[PDB]
Every structure is written in structure tokens, then in C-alpha cells.
Amino acid sequence: TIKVGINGFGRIGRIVFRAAQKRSDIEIVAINDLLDADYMAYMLKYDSTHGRFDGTVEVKDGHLIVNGKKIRVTAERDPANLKWDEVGVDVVAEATGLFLTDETARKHITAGAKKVVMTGPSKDNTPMFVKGANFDKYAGQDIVSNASCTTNCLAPLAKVINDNFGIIEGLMTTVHATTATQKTVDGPSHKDWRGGRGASQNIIPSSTGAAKAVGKVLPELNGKLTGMAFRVPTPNVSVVDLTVRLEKAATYEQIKAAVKAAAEGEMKGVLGYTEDDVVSTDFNGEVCTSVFDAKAGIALNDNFVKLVSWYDNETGYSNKVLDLIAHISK
Amino acid sequence: TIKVGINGFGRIGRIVFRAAQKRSDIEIVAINDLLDADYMAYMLKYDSTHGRFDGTVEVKDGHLIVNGKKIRVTAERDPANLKWDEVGVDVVAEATGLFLTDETARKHITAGAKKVVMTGPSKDNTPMFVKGANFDKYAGQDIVSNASCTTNCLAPLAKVINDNFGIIEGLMTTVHATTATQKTVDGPSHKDWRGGRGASQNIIPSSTGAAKAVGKVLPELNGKLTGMAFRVPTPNVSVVDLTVRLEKAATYEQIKAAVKAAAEGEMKGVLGYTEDDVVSTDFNGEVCTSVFDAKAGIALNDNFVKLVSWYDNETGYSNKVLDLIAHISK
């Protein structure tokens, strides 16, 4: 089993923890964040969005005993003072959103661990690997990024579509659920004015690097797609609205079949497929990072279509982070 | 002044009434609906979305006294027994959403009114007129429709874009605010399963005629546009996300300039233009049916762009309904 340590017990940090519980190939051994041990236990036991932790969790000696296994708990504002080696940590799930560059994240290896998986997109040249898009391109790097929730949703779908009919050009919009980055009421956001407005009262036009980021994980699409977002008043689960221009004519039935095939083979577990009358809450807890909504999309013609794909921006992404930890441990 | 009478005192009926107050060319003399006069007054005095009625309103003998002028209250299930002539009603604002056909809507002419204006898309062949798109095509018809809030937003914008650079094809999406047809918690919606799901908990993919309806008001675009909707948990203010491929190449700066020009001239009052970091609540009360958001849209290249336009699905549409009453009366 790969020994994992989590840095930053935010939403991603905690769901990565929860999802890791059902996997045998991995084990969380330590958690670092500026939070008491008993506070961490509370944030783990109860989840407004995901329900009560399915298992046992207790505080003993300022550390955690989750599901009977001991979890080293620390609190270092600095990543180099983490003695990961002491707890025998192989990979570190960098989930604080603070150390998204080789320079900063390297300190984990400096601090005693082998590899670092950033739970966010790289701020520098650190490679981004997205399951179902380019895991096969992993070249043994020791510091990697798993991109963002949105890219993990769009990347797989874009690959299928591009690979089967060829994407000439595409523009996407993601109707994204509220995040911890937003505000309850009109607050301060110096680098993003719209982003500061009351989250629950508005449809907030936002930006996203996903589309372009996809051009990096699937270079063949570099410069081919771009997009934006719309933050809406929901606690979790978002949807990508991909409008593309196809090279090869393809009926909607042909696109539904190409996607369903991937969802059932090469991309099983990453890409999902559905023909049901689903809504966002029907995916809260969804592990597939991209679930194609057959009935939701619309084709104007065989070369201009609109595709719709769901994703639990929390559970899906978090599970894949663990898929990447396993992959680079292969 | 055109003497008007409202049938159906739902959201549209009450907001058409409210906005009608500022117009000197129009007067509301009667309202029909299965509701007491004192209940009507309550629905008029207080609005969760638009605040308290700006003016006086009271009940005197099962009839309303708003800002002085008396309003004739009634409660007929069959439009034919409405005696509009008795109160001198020239045009009837059909807002029950129940009589969207000539045979049913005509029941108003029969009952004493000169003309009828459906506050929703026709269900038969009744002409649809949208301000800024084809008000000039009106040919004396005594029964007309004002299309939907979405079409009143999408139509003006597509005309500017089409008229300047020519729309080869396009696919839109509207992130629409919750409406009265939705449910508070998972309820029944026989003709639309998705639409029955709890409004406040989901992003609900919904259908829309808007795009295909624009093909009717602006025939030149017939079969060239289509789209869908995403119903989000907000009380009011929606936005259209239009992705188009243009014939004549146009930089985003050329598109912003074409729209801004239309808004300051030929389409002043219908089309708006903003370069501010706005959100949906910034348009609650917006009279312009289509407000171009310059900073929100994005162009991939000079022939493929994503355009964003806001609209208060209540106040804007309601205002244009009165605009159509004044028009067909001119």
C-alpha cells in the first residue's frame, strides 16, 4: 500500500481522505493543517454535503484514530518541517492550494517524501495528468498536478469527441457550484470582482482555465477550445456545456454511441454515460469525473453540437487524485 | 390612453401592472383572476423579488383603488363573460398562460375588447412580435403574442450579430432563474420529469423554444439556431450564453462596438450594453430585455464566439408586453 500524507484539510483534502478509505492500494498516514486534532475529527465526522463519515473516528493523544488506524496529525505553516519520512510517507497530496509550483512543493520531498501530487492546476511547468486523457504520458516525474475538477470533466469528453470525429473548434461554459472561495454575502475579492458577490443570490460569471488546460493535457487540441464559467447557488456538483464544431459529420446517435463505448471500455470509471432525466443532485457522490448526459445535449446538425457532462467537483476529482497517486506509484 | 385589462394575476400579470404604472400612454382599468380583491391587493403591496409597491393601494367594495384610479376586479373562468366593453378595455393582456391560441384568446374580442396580447409564446399560428426584432412587421392583427422572456433576450442580440457579420449557425444556452412552474421539493411534473425536481437544490437541464422561436421572429435565422436551458436556484434574472459561427470575420472589439451602437441607437431601451463586472442581482429591475455583458463573453477566433446577455425574465418582458400593447394600438 502506498503511504499518503495530506497537506491542507479543506474540502478536497477531506474528501480525498474519505474516498481513500475504500481503497486497499492506498493508506493515509498523516494530515497537516493549522487545525486542532479534535477539530479535524469534527470536520471529518460531519459533512453538510456528503453526510456523516461512514466509519469510526476518535482523538487520542492529540492524534486521530480513524477506522481503528492511527493518523499522525501535525500543523506546520511550512512544508519543509513535516518529517514525512518519520511517518513513512511515499506520496503527498498537496491540497492547500498554496504550493502549486516545483519550488514550493519540492519541500515535501526535501521534507522526507518521494512524490507530490498537487490537488490543483500547476502555477508553473509542473506536468498535469488527467485520467482518461493522458495518464499514459507519465514519465516518472516526482511532482505532478491532477488539474482541476472542470478539466477532469472536459478532458475525457474532449478526447472521445476529438478522437472519433475530430474537433475543429470548441467553446465551453461550466455551470459551476459554489466553492469555499466565494462569499456568503457581497464581500472582498481584489483579483476577481464578480467572484466576491453574494454566492447564494447570484449567477456569477467566472473564469476558468480548464479549456486551455485541456490543450496542455491533450496537445492536439491546443488552441482549439476555450471557455468560461457561471457560478450558481448550489453546494456541489457542476456541469460542462461543450459546444463544438466537428470535422467528421456525426449524427447525435453516433456521438451518443462513441461516448457510451468509451464509458464502457478504455475510459470506464472516468467517463460515465446516462440517458435518464437527471439533475445535479443525482450526481452528488459521483466517482466518474465526467458523466455524459445524452438527453440534455443538442445537435444543430452533424457538425455543430452541444454536449452536456456532469461531475461532482468534489468526489470525482478527489478520487482521481488518488488514482494519480497510485499511477505514479506503479 | 389605451385602456387595458389583465387576465391572470401571476408574476407577469402583477409586474406588467407595476411597470404599467409609470406609462402615461396606458391605463389598467380591470384585472381578472380567481382571487379576492383584498388578496390581489396583498400580492400587489408586497413582492419578495421587487419590493413593496411604490404607491397607494386599497380595497373598496371588492374592487381596487391603486394610486387613486379604481380598478375593476372580477373572477371569471371563461374569458367570454368578461364584459371588457363595460369597462372600456381596448387591449387585453392575456397572462393566464391558459389561452395561447386564437380560438381561446378570441374569446376576449367576443367579450368586448378590441385587441389581445398573449404574454407567452403562441400555441397555434398567432403572430409573435419581439421589440427590436420585428415590431415593424406588425400588420394590424388584433391577436398577437410577445414570445417568451428568453426570446426577448436572444432575438434582439442575434439580429445585431446577424445583421453585422451574419450568423452561419449558433447554439445557445440560458441559465434561467426559477419560475412558478417549478417545485420547492421533488414533486410531480408529468410532461417534464426533470422540471419536477426540487428547484432550490438543483441545476435542472430544461428545454426551451427560444432559439427556434427566434427563427420565426427573424426568419432569416430560421433553422440556424437552437439551444436549451439550465434552471438554477435563483428567484429572478436569467442570462443567455450564445455560441455562434460568423460569416464575416469580426474581432471581439468589433462585436462589442456593434452591440453598443445598437444599444445607443436603433435598439435603445431593448438592447443594453455594459463592460462592468456585473452579476445577476445587478439586473433585478432591468427594463432592457437584453443587456450585453462585454467582459463575460469570449472569442476563440474571429468567426467563433460565445456571447453573454442578461435579462430580468420578469421586469424586462413585462415592460415589452406593454410596449407591444402601445405598438399594436398606434
Curated annotation (Swiss-Prot), chains A, B:
What's the chief localization of this chain? cytoplasm
Q: Which InterPro entries match?
A: GlycerAld/Erythrose_P_DH, GlycerAld_3-P_DH_AS, GlycerAld_3-P_DH_cat, GlycerAld_3-P_DH_NAD(P)-bd, Glyceraldehyde-3-P_DH_1, NAD(P)-bd_dom_sf
Q: What is the effect of changing Y42I?
A: In strain: ECOR 70
Q: Which residues carry this modification: N6-succinyllysine?
A: K114, K123, K131, K191, K212, K216, K224, K248, K256, K260, K330
Mutation: H176N; reported impact is:
Reduces activity about 50-fold
| GO molecular function annotations of the record | glyceraldehyde-3-phosphate dehydrogenase (NAD+) (phosphorylating) activity; identical protein binding; NAD binding; NADP binding
Q: How does it assemble?
A: Homotetramer.
Q: NCBIfam families from the xrefs?
A: GAPDH-I, PRK15425.1
Function of the protein: Catalyzes the oxidative phosphorylation of glyceraldehyde 3-phosphate (G3P) to 1,3-bisphosphoglycerate (BPG) using the cofactor NAD. The first reaction step involves the formation of a hemiacetal intermediate between G3P and a cysteine residue, and this hemiacetal intermediate is then oxidized to a thioester, with concomitant reduction of NAD to NADH. The reduced NADH is then exchanged with the second NAD, and the thioester is attacked by a nucleophilic inorganic phosphate to produce BPG.
Q: Which PANTHER family match?
A: GLYCERALDEHYDE 3-PHOSPHATE DEHYDROGENASE, GLYCERALDEHYDE-3-PHOSPHATE DEHYDROGENASE-RELATED
What is the recorded name of this protein?
Answer: Glyceraldehyde-3-phosphate dehydrogenase A
In its UniProt entry, the species of origin is given as Escherichia coli (strain K12)
